[model samples]
Target: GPVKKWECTVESNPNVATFIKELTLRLPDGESVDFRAGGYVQLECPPHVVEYKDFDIQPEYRGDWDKFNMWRYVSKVDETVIRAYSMANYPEEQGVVKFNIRIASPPPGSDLPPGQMSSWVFNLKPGDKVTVYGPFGEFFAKDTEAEMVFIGGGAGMAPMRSHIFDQLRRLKSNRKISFWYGARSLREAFYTEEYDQLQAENPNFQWHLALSDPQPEDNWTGLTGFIHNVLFENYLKDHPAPEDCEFYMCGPPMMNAAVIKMLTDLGVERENILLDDFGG
Candidate 1:
């Protein structure tokens, strides 16, 4: 893996939810190492005291901790951990790279510690300095003339969002596309209005939302059940030529596995489906 080092400041980081944050970075240099739409960068977090707001992580049990002495004896050592996250913004956008990161914390009652690097990202402020390296991953979109479909969930939205934006904005494409996004509830979803606006403005673009575990109070009345099912019934149902469309998907490994089976059953060749589950 090739690497290029970058020193940037946290421009603005706003908590989008209890477990998610929208982090914007300020690139000090005018340009950065060029990258594709779905590529990711690695953020390095130095050893630091991480406080879990809800669940306290015992440092003694974790590999990242220094050691037990005075509970504060050793200042620290040079132990920096790197974590990868896909970019939610295209490199063509502004001079900064934005990320929508879900804080990876141990569940309540679990003995595990919060992710070493993810936890540090949340603790950073606007002026804090951060180091990042290399745009990695080949999970990018290409061949715009072909009809495309995008399916995503969870933090999978990062790369998928980048591709959709690049398609309409950068490529100025009007190719027919069907984007199906799944979440437990509307509150957990992102890019709802933005995709809606894209669909409304472009006749060839269509977007759908599927809620699997909608709360009674949510009042979600659109598509319900697995998002892949909704995609099959709505668009893939009676289409004359299912093999002509290219499928791009990113999400939980289970979702990807299930959808791949469905697509294969519908006669789509394996080569037509481009997937990057990122190991769930």
Candidate 2:
């Protein structure tokens, strides 16, 4: 498509964002659709708290990363069109873009304070509205007919969650596959049970949740350390031919770059690996 514009209403602040704030965004008609996976919707900022952290993405990845860009306006929040994050919830939930943003503190040692957008929206009770830019991006492959592997973490769960379920619904999980995710802790991690349940049910889906940091007495039994090691050494160990796999990755710059190298080292062909520094 070329370009589009829209208005949205806050559906719910069902999940707690960072620091007692709520995670809030609006829905396009409260329904979802299957666009490209990496696409995002920009919302106009409403009045929100200030001095909070910004998006973790690097500047180079920002422009042109999304094909479905949406812009909105906000009060109390800084900037005319604050660039909010965009991601997919699950492929099965189509025509809708989602974000797994957290209310967070600013970069450590910085005098900037905390996440204004996050803190402001996080504080919203519910039933608020904001303007939207456009749905922007094509991080996900359009054709749903490909056999694949999805690796992600943190809010990275958004897109992969969409792809795997979309594939499952189509009865097309019959190739070498893995959905590996790394989280700082169990609490920091979401969708563990969902992936586990997927693992148990889908013969082609292998779900691995690596906890990079575990609290003592939390007593976790899973892979440890950054996702790069897990992808190349742990997941690819004694595994099938890498030539047969299509790798799809979305996450922070640290892990996104690291895992790309890891996947290449594991003999996965460069042509088979598809990732976006933009999608994270």
Candidate 3:
């Protein structure tokens, strides 16, 4: 049998005035596929027909690209191009899958141009048609009675948020859950209100935001450090029993490795910590 292809219409496209974007894709069929709580879809396009940005490629990106294992997809223009993003919501009615995409563009000190697929996704307007391959990946949460600690950063928010929704709503889970999310500044801390509401609604759920480098006018008053360190000091210190809790992590490679190391150092076994590093 041939692999199935699904078409989802862009229902909403809200830009955060920067790289951050919130998009909702609606599948006309209510139940085109039975997706688990924290699953992602692979967006696809016809080969050799996609548009892209042209640029004089930089040498640093050639190294940093593979170093970060940055998402890329092929383009006939030249070289191996890749771009990937994670889906940001649980499977909702009307076959909805939300995405909080952080579009990739060249930052200061780097001369590379914007990403091809990411630029296309970011520029998509409501009602635009997009093609996706599958609801792939098995990065879902286990239905366990163990306490859940969700650690994420940057665009990694999608899966963690999905897992949280499953625990709070779908599973109606009352297990003690703590979510620690990191961002460079307040502006990038997307969905603060939603997580705050979740915390207020469920006593079992806790959300913490950590800002690494905040500006003064931002008026930031929260944990100021790496997200994982904040977790270690605030929760893991008091409850050092790794067997009593399960850790789920996703984010940049360094951040993920740091948290995993901290957890293992505190006696967390390999099996208890479930990690999805964007397949890096």
For candidate 3, report its TM-score.
0.82
Best candidate, lDDT-wise?
1
Best by TM-score: 1
Per-residue C-alpha lDDT of model 2 across residues 1-280, encoded as one tens digit per residue: 6546555566555442112212445556655433555666665665443322232222332332132121121225545545656554654554445567644444544555445555555444445666666567656653544457788865667777767765665535565467888777665666667778877888877888777887675598878888778766775766677656678887777888888888787777888888755432
Please list the residue runs of candidate 2 whose C-alpha ends up more than 4 Å from where it truly belongs after superposition.
14-34, 46-76, 91-97, 113-116, 142-147, 170-172
lDDT of 2 at 9: 61
* Ordering by TM-score: 1, 3, 2
Clashing pairs in 3: 71-82, 71-83, 72-82, 72-83, 73-81, 73-82, 73-83
Backbone clash numbers for all candidates listed: 0, 40, 7
Full-model lDDT, candidate 1: 0.76
Give Cα distance to truth, residue 106, candidate 3, Å.
3.7
Task: Encode model 1's per-residue lDDT on 1-280: one tens digit a residue.
Answer: 5688788889887654335567778777776657788888888888787554322223322222223211221122248888788888876786677887766655444555556676777667889898878878788776758899999877788888888888888888889888888878776677788898988888888888899988687788889888778888888988888899989998777789878888999999999999976663
- After superposing candidate 1, which stretches have Cα over 4 Å from the reference? 54-78
Candidate 3 contains a number of clashing pairs equal to 7
- The lDDT of each candidate is 0.76, 0.60, 0.72
